[PDB]
Amino acid sequence: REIVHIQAGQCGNQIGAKFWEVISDEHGIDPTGSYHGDSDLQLERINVYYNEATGNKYVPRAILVDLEPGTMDSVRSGPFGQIFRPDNFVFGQSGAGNNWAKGHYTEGAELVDSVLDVVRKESESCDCLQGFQLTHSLGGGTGSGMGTLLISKIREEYPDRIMNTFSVMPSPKVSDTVVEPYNATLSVHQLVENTDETYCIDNEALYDICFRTLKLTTPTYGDLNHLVSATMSGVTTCLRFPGQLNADLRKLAVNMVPFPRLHFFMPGFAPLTSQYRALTVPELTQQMFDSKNMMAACDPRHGRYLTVAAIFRGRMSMKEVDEQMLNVQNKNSSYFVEWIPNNVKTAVCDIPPRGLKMSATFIGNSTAIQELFKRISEQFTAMFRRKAFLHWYTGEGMDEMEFTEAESNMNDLVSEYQQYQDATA
Amino acid sequence: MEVIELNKCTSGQSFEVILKPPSDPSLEEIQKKLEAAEERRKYQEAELLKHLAE
Amino acid sequence: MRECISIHVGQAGVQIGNACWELYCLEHGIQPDGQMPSDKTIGGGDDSFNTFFSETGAGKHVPRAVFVDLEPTVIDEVRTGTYRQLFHPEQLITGKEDAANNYARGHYTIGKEIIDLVLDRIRKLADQCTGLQGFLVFHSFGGGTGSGFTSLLMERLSVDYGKKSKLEFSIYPAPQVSTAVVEPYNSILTTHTTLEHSDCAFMVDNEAIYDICRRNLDIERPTYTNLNRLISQIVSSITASLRFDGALNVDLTEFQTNLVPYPRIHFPLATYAPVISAEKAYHEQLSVAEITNACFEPANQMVKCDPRHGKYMACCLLYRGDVVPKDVNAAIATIKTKRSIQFVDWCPTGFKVGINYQPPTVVPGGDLAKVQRAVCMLSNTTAIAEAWARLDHKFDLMYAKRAFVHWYVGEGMEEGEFSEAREDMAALEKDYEEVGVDS
Amino acid sequence: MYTFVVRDENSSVYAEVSRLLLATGQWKRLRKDNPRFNLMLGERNRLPFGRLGHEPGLVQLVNYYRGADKLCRKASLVKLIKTSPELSESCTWFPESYVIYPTDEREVFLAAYNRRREGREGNVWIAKSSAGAISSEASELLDFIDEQGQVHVIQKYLEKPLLLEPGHRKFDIRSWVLVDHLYNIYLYREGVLRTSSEPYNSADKTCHLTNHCIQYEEGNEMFFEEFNQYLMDALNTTLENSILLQIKHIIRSCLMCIEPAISTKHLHYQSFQLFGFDFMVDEELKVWLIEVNGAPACAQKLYAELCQGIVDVAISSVFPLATSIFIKLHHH
């Protein structure tokens, strides 16, 4: 039933805030937490993400976390800042210095108990908790280091609940600091053990989409976060709106993850928006499966899809949707594994996103994602082979061994993806 | 082709037509399996919490 | 008069149960508040419809039904629906969180927590039965509740109600309507566990119902409501002999006697005709011979398969409406010479026939045209093994890579249970080949 | 475009059909076990018909009729002709045949054999079976059947075959027949005669077998223009009149007989199949059906045109792309 949302760090809080703006709009909730919608389907599954406080107010079941106050202060000042529960803001002052060790071992350890206190308080008010979704980046300190520490503690205290993350992967094209490959590599290992579903949101891909498709010569983080918020709204649509599938996080994990470690999804969206022309179902299906519309910078033609989940939003012909989906599978027969029957699932929701008559959101468990983890691993090794920048971490108590193990684990992950990219029936 | 066993009533009738003649586990045994599965769950969870403790 | 208790497990079982009890109420003149004007014995009786409805002193006819689901949203539709007044709250059992399409989660993890409460409510229905015949169990193959909780419940029913008959209505999984990629797993697991606890099981392939809805009702995208109204017509024609005066199939034991010569091969193939669109303006009423011929068309079967390439072990014809035995025997004469109907050499080549004069009833505003005569054919033919083959192949494709297996082991199952279940299915397939094929 | 799969590499004809399908650029081959195919050029044995026609969005077609083995199996053919009212034991074009096990007919075979020895009639018989790839004494026949471990047919041996001159030599006729998803029957205009080079000696299996593997014209294969010209010169008649009306009649009888049991109309998948009919001709210009082959190879010269005929008539009629070489045998 209920989902508990957590956003950690600068990136995590900015994409999280956009997410709450978008879905609050879709459910007709104004910045003061009041419902002003015209349809009842807006409120049918509203409690998945919102508590109801008397006065007919809805409060996001969201927890905002950071080790420095700036980004959370902006969230409180931004649009919809007054919708969040003020007790749910949990922040320190020292910051994490884009250092995974500081978020995981030193500064973050000091704040983690207060976060877990707010988490416990939200869980206790849950009729039946499904699990948690975390928004964060892997390139920084707080979202990456403290994010994964939080996930570990939450798994300890709620071993049977689902753990889902939207994880922003760093890219040299949109780099804050050079140590991003270290942080991400350390984070990936944690995710491999302690999440059931992770949406890989690659900043390289977001940049390319803004530059090439959306024709934006100079993208900002806000422009990337528009794509991220549209995607997050797409993938959670089946959770938030009534439908024939009655989807929840655990059903999504069971049907998308054939092997526990291989749970890193490639999201995709169509039409790419930043235009009044109506988009037909064939165009939606062609764009949806195009690499240029996917938000992890991997080529799906370099691997094979283990599983696919697609949701179409708006008023359209379901017969045409099924026709186009079956057609695209037949055109791309070589890129779907044959030893999983019926591994492409389609859902429909009558309600479209804001400012579109119809859209499509794509969730792919593809072996091509190994490219992403290879990219990071290369960057990691390039610095690690000379021990470059390691002192920032050894100064916080870590040892080279932990780095060697994280690298080894990620290369293992890549190997595991290759094993099933080759396997056939 | 013969018709046999014709029964009639107010709601309907029934008959047979022939065209050619011919040419458990106990309750305890259940609870042992269920309790075995519960134990394998509890063991795997204990291994998880041990790992997290490390 | 001997009672029959219906058990509806999981989403598919519950929604189909809804369609069925709505149809029963229309067929017996029972109104949604439980009142039945034509019943002159208030508060009691041993009429034929009393096998499915008990009576209260207030004149309410209450289904002998239990609805079970591991989450509440589907059964809540029963609680707040048109026929809410029909059921005692004690009859609608709901859980907290479903089985997430996981057999192991429904059989072991979550089932073990609710099985005793379900058995309790069932025992409460059985206590008001002067002579309980047995149970009719409705469920899907593919769902986690539908498969796992049903198999556990069937074990416990074989324990607590030995000497009582158990019949299944099973929704066989189709990609056109499916919910999960792991449905082949759940199908094999629940079939293996349930096989020795079920006396007779009627499989309904969602693919067949879907195609019949598209083709005969001109519904481009059939919903669960359409599928379930068609399925409820078939179920009604199967249980009509239990609910009405008659001489054929008057007790659950007779289904085994007439349809199942060997205990493991207890899956009769159902074929239904005619299915006519209601929005269709111009209708023409099919003859006894036309619908009886339709019973041998693969496109009207509940499971897609070719009986021409199998052997019959038993064939029973259930007519409803304007039908007299003369037309039935004429039609049979024609068909025996125009179709390939081979029987096993150790069974008579007869047809057991039953006729109910009351024509099929349809839901007002439904998509089914009301016809003057209809027939459901139940035949036990080896051709249905094709469906098992299909299912088993899918199982094999995934299990060769152990895909998704970890979700089951994580609940307490063992990898060995998969192979055990699959070997049982291989035995079942071999049994069908031994009974039905020549060299 | 159109997807298809291949599950019979040994197939001579459908290796060429597989060749052509790619040659149109609009057909893409798949792996053997990928079930998302429009077409299956499938295997001879254990072909899983039960798994066809269940893929959503796909129209599925297979190059074999389930149940057509009753025609293409010798004991099955004999049983099918004796027990079908449409054919019957009376039918004139099938040589007298019996089935013997080493459901059995060992008593009636000898029962007629005595009626032939007493009648002083030509009493030569041949025993054979489906597994393989002649005598006047029955004891020598049955003792030969019991030494191998399979069901065998004993059939009358045509002691008066038509003989090609020059040579005084025996032949057999092969006709290729395509049955499509609508059960139209198409007789390929080009048949072949498979001849014997050693003169017929009614008093050595080579002289009495036509098969080619055991063996005037190139490769002992005489084609229809030449056999027709020979029939005109030597016997003042045409192939059409003297032989081809009977061949067409037999093909129609056999196929119409089993149509209700194998037809894929109203089924969830569709079948087609190419058959090889093997006929015998006696000195009265009477045509006798010898055997029906379900997976035949073609004549090397006739692989082309014919395989294009399979693609034209059988495959692209259901899966269309972006003068007839077939004779449509009409039927109801």
Ligand SMILES: Nc1nc2c(ncn2[C@@H]2O[C@H](COP(=O)(O)OP(=O)(O)OP(=O)(O)O)[C@@H](O)[C@H]2O)c(=O)[nH]1
């Ligand atoms: N014909 C028909 N099939 C249904 C219906 N509901 C679900 N199904 C089929 O049942 C299968 C899924 O099983 P469910 O009954 O939904 O699952 P469940 O038993 O509720 O168990 P959970 O996994 O806990 O949700 C799919 O193959 C569906 O096509 C229905 O109302 N009618």
Ligand SMILES: Nc1ncnc2c1ncn2[C@@H]1O[C@H](COP(=O)(O)OP(=O)(O)CP(=O)(O)O)[C@@H](O)[C@H]1O
């Ligand atoms: N009753 C008969 N009278 C005369 N010759 C006969 C005969 N039966 C068989 N033959 C000869 O035996 C040969 C092969 O017999 P058979 O019917 O087994 O064909 P076959 O299956 O071996 C060749 P294929 O596989 O190409 O059809 C024929 O070419 C024919 O000349």
Ligand SMILES: Nc1nc2c(ncn2[C@@H]2O[C@H](COP(=O)(O)OP(=O)(O)O)[C@@H](O)[C@H]2O)c(=O)[nH]1
């Ligand atoms: N898409 C996106 N990426 C961001 C945003 N902010 C930071 N990043 C990326 O996140 C990484 C830096 O981590 P950050 O969240 O700022 O550090 P933290 O506060 O310690 O968690 C780098 O890869 C940045 O490119 C944002 O708003 N949107």
Ligand SMILES: COc1ccc(/C=C\c2cc(OC)c(OC)c(OC)c2)cc1O
């Ligand atoms: C193998 O494919 C499957 C993939 C997912 C599910 C279950 C739920 C589900 C959940 C979703 O988000 C919460 C979702 O997309 C928004 C979705 O789209 C179809 C489905 C079931 C399947 O059979």
Ligand SMILES: [Ca+2]
């Ligand atoms: Ca401090």
Ligand SMILES: [Ca+2]
């Ligand atoms: Ca504390």
Ligand SMILES: [Ca+2]
């Ligand atoms: Ca009464």
Ligand SMILES: [Ca+2]
């Ligand atoms: Ca029993």
Ligand SMILES: [Mg+2]
């Ligand atoms: Mg930053």
Ligand SMILES: [Mg+2]
């Ligand atoms: Mg359910």
